[PDB]
Design a protein around this ligand. Structure first.
Ligand SMILES: [Cl-]
Ligand SMILES: [Mg+2]
Ligand SMILES: [Mg+2]
Ligand SMILES: [Mg+2]
Ligand SMILES: [Mg+2]
Ligand SMILES: [Mg+2]
Ligand SMILES: [Mg+2]
Ligand SMILES: [Mg+2]
Ligand SMILES: [Mg+2]
Ligand SMILES: [Mg+2]
Ligand SMILES: [Mg+2]
Ligand SMILES: [Mg+2]
Ligand SMILES: [Mg+2]
Ligand SMILES: [Mg+2]
Ligand SMILES: [Zn+2]
Lengths: 50, 136, 188
RNA sequence: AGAACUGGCGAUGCGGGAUGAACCGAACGUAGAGUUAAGGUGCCGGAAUACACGCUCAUCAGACACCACAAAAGGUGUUAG
RNA sequence: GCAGUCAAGCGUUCAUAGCGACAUUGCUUUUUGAUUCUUCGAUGUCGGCUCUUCCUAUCAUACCGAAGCAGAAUUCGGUAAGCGUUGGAUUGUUCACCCACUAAUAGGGAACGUGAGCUGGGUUUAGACCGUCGUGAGACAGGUUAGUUUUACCCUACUGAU
């Protein structure tokens, strides 16, 4: 189901991860929303499945 | 009891703490079993782990064939001298304490059991029931 | 930097009447009536004519001005809610276990029931908020449609359905099973 | 732990630093009146919840020398450059 | 002892899933030193036993984020001290080392908690033996054996009772 697989991947896979607190972030985010890491800009994309 | 048990067991009064020596009721060649641990036992300061009818224990053979000695093996208690109450209101006890050598799965190392076997032990362990002659 | 004046414009169509007093907004249109309490922003509303309403902030800082545009959007959503409505479309995504969704009644509470999610024996129920109607569209495989006048009520009700079907103790990249919002639009 | 110059404590109360041998102010016969020092004036507490221009919102704010601790590195938090 | 910053590199490709050289900034007082302020008209000295409470730098349990997370298993991280964290062989031991059970066998503080609470195996009086050293009396933070553990009726605290 390529159409449905893309829709589910938009909520589960197309995300960014904070390098300091592992928070799940929007893909186009520039800073983390969490106060624990001081809104750091050190972010990485979420790793794809295999 | 550990793995291999079929069903659960209602609580039976404990009468075999660690260090107890019970007779070996199978024909594997051992003559007694020295209990060093009880499977599924809890933790409490200064409290000795203790076993009852139908429990699986870790034991060492003190008297018997030389190849069965100087090693740790699981065993299953089949008779108990300490009195216990059944859910039908009957208090009962055996004349001696006895066990049989088994594996972690519960399969018996021997193939014959001498003397009576408690009903609770037979229901919990299908292999013991097969090799038993008289239940209770 | 304490800007002297900031203004936003709010348009109303012919069939919509808006009454604002003491930061109480009541929007009445062809589809019904919506109300909202805004006694937490400190703004001033004024009427230019029957088709234009202004909202302003006087001597406001950067943070205070940022909330002025929020007021405009919130009021505008009320206006288009009573005129065009809102429709949220959701799809069922599963790999092996089909997902069965039905509307059930429990003590007159109008719940929605989700069964057999990843083979779970547990029954999942989500309350349906007041003013939200749920329909199962035909000629489309595994689609549920939520409609209402309030965008917040419709969106949050659909959000509850997504959250209730989250996979636990599994790699969510592989186990992509759930119900997700697929389209946001209007009734008209 | 050990030296240099000076001022102190020890040998010294008094006002201030909540509290303190050494800091700040000031050194003492018994009293009255007036004016001040350092430090203070929401309440405890004598004295402006005075005036004026800004800055800051902390789900561990900050608050006055000696003094009773905090750093490197960061934040499209907000402000000015 | 514990925790950051930088990122040359490790990781089939790929600095930062998990790690990380050369450097550098801190924290802690559960190590040991440094110091000699208090106590020599005496604050009972090792360990164990018993019992209460506290800290979190979290071993297990609750709910989550991340992975080079298919499943299973494991690994990194967050909120969290609510609740648990054992039975044994040898040793006076703290420590250590094995056996076994377990959801797990996490680390610490309270005058290195706790001797008018105990115990007295060790250390640390006087007896005695050995080795090395000393002409000798004797020495040895070397080994060995035997060696008295006192008092509460007062105040407070606590537990119950008028
Ligand atoms: Cl000599
Ligand atoms: Mg000195
Ligand atoms: Mg003198
Ligand atoms: Mg002070
Ligand atoms: Mg006054
Ligand atoms: Mg004295
Ligand atoms: Mg004393
Ligand atoms: Mg004394
Ligand atoms: Mg002590
Ligand atoms: Mg004593
Ligand atoms: Mg004592
Ligand atoms: Mg005492
Ligand atoms: Mg002794
Ligand atoms: Mg002696
Ligand atoms: Zn972050």
């Amino acid at each position: 189901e390529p159409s449905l697989k893309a829709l589910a991947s938009k909520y589960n896979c197309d995300k960014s991860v904070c390098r300091k607190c592992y928070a799940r972030l929007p893909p186009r985010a520039t800073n983390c929303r969490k106060r624990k890491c001081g809104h750091t800009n050190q972010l990485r994309p979420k790793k794809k499945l295999k | 009891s550990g793995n291999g048990a079929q069903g659960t067991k209602f609580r039976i009064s404990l009468g075999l703490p660690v260090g107890a020596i019970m007779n070996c009721a199978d024909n594997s060649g051992a003559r007694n079993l020295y209990i060093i641990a009880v499977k599924g036992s809890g933790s409490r300061l200064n409290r000795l782990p203790a076993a009852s009818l139908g429990d699986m224990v870790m034991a060492t053979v003190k008297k018997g064939k030389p190849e069965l000695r100087k090693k740790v093996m699981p065993a299953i208690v089949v008779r108990q001298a300490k009195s216990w109450r059944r859910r039908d209101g009957v208090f009962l006890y055996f004349e001696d304490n006895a066990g049989v050598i088994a594996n972690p799965k519960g399969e018996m190392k021997g193939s014959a059991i001498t003397g009576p076997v408690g009903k609770e032990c037979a229901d919990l362990w299908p292999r013991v029931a097969s090799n038993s002659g008289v239940v209770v | 930097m304490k800007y002297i004046q900031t203004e936003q414009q709010i348009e109303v169509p012919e069939g919509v009447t808006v009454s604002i007093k003491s930061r109480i907004v009541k929007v009445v249109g062809p589809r019904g009536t919506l109300t909202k309490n805004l006694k937490h922003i400190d703004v001033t509303f004024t009427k230019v004519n029957n088709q234009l309403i202004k909202v302003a902030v006087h001597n406001g800082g950067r943070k205070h001005v940022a909330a002025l545009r929020t007021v405009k959007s919130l009021v505008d959503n009320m206006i288009t809610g009573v005129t065009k409505g809102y429709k949220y479309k959701m799809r069922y995504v599963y790999a092996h276990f089909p997902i069965n969704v039905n509307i059930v009644e429990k003590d007159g509470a109008k719940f929605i029931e989700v069964r057999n999610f990843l083979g779970d024996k547990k029954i999942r129920n989500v309350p349906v908020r007041d003013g939200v109607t749920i329909e199962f569209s035909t000629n489309v495989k595994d689609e549920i449609v939520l409609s209402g006048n309030s965008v917040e009520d419709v969106s949050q009700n659909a959000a509850d359905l997504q959250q209730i079907c989250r996979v636990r103790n599994k790699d969510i990249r592989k186990f992509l099973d759930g119900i997700y919002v697929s389209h946001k639009g209007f009734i008209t």
